[PDB]
Amino acid sequence: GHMRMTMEEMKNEAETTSMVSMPLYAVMYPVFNELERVNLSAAQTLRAAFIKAEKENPGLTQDIIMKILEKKSVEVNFTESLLRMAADDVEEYMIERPEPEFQDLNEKARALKQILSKIPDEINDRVRFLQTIKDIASAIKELLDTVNNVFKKYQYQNRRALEHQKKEFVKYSKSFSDTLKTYFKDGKAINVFVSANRLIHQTNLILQTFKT
């Protein structure tokens, strides 16, 4: 849906136009705009509190933002940990079919997710990181073959949307490639961790469509 504004909010926002307050609009409003379409109550309550606080103490949002940016290395550490954990297969992906072809697919999916989760600990040595990138390539390569080997040969259930998750996996796989290239110019490693964690999620979605 869409956030609603009270009269008191309307008044406050109109009285809050000095330059120190622009980060409310330039950074927080786009956030509230995205939040709106998945979590309406949070978006509205958070905007409400931000607007009142900003109006009564202009500069507050800028202060909060700068302090969040200051704590960047907490977030890098946190994102590293998310990635490391992402490989911990819940055993709800493990294919219930005893066939060697579905056993082959599980192992190659565990393989790829395993290497990707170790990125935080290889990235600081260019030699080891280059190897890791090579291992990722072989893992992706070997998984796509097993998908294709099981695709035409076996299943073809009620869902042929298994085709789309391969198209998605590839799209996300190509995107991770771009992020690596961007990192080797930026040094901003957080983009790589975020990107590796998405590819893991996509690998899981392939494994989910075979069950449900």
């Binding site: 280059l130 990138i133 090579k134 796989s173």
Partner: peptide
Amino acid sequence: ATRELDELMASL
């Protein structure tokens, strides 16, 4: 090392 990753995405 970077080559084979670029060679894979080229096939796709």
